[PDB]
Amino acid sequence: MVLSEGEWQLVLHVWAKVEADVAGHGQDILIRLFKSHPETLEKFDRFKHLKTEAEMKASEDLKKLGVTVLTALGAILKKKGHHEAELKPLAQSHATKHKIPIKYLEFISEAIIHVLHSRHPGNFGADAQGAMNKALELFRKDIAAKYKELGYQG
Numbered sequence: 001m002v003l004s005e006g007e008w009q010l011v012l013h014v015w016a017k018v019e020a021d022v023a024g025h026g027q028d029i030l031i032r033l034f035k036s037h038p039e040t041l042e043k044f045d046r047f048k049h050l051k052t053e054a055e056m057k058a059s060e061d062l063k064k065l066g067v068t069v070l071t072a073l074g075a076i077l078k079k080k081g082h083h084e085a086e087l088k089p090l091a092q093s094h095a096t097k098h099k100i101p102i103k104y105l106e107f108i109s110e111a112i113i114h115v116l117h118s119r120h121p122g123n124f125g126a127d128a129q130g131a132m133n134k135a136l137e138l139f140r141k142d143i144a145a146k147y148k149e150l151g152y153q154g
């Protein structure tokens with residue numbers, strides 16, 4: 001697929017608001033993901049013991065990972081589709097070390113859209129959400145193709 005410039009503008013305009021507080025957005029998203037799809041928590045050896053949202057909110061490590069995850073995603077979105085290099089090491093570790101199925105990337109994509117929708121309603125109307133969804137679908141489609149070359153496709 002290919003986004004237009006206008007669509008990228010809508011995606012990078014709401015992302016600039018996320019970047020004003022990357023750790024808080026990273027916490028919200030990861031907790032929204034673990035609450036909605038608890039099975040995903042299991043993939044995190046360091047955090048699967050967390051039992052409640054209060055514990056999750058208090059975890060320093062969880063917050064640090066949230067910032068790592070959003071910072072990588074931001075770097076990929078800022079490429080505007082030219083993200084082959086950035087996707088290579090990401091695909092290799094998620095397909096070979098962590099083993100994250102494509103279905104779980106669809107789950108965090110839903111959590112990202114849920115959190116932008118509640119924290120940035122003014123900059124995340126229907127056109128901006130459709131553009132963000134297209135951008136994450138592009139990201140998933142290119143990651144799934146890399147998974148396949150790497151021998152995992154999950």
Ligand code: HEM
Binds near residue numbers: 069070090093094
């Ligand atoms: C927006 C999509 C995502 C991005 C951009 C992303 C990015 C990252 C990055 C940059 C790291 C650290 C370096 C490396 O291990 O590659 C990481 C680690 C990891 N990610 Fe992802 N990730 C995403 C989705 C997920 C999903 C959906 C899961 C599980 C449901 C997941 C599981 C993990 C695990 C288990 C680690 C290692 C954590 C630790 O340090 O112990 N990631 N991810």
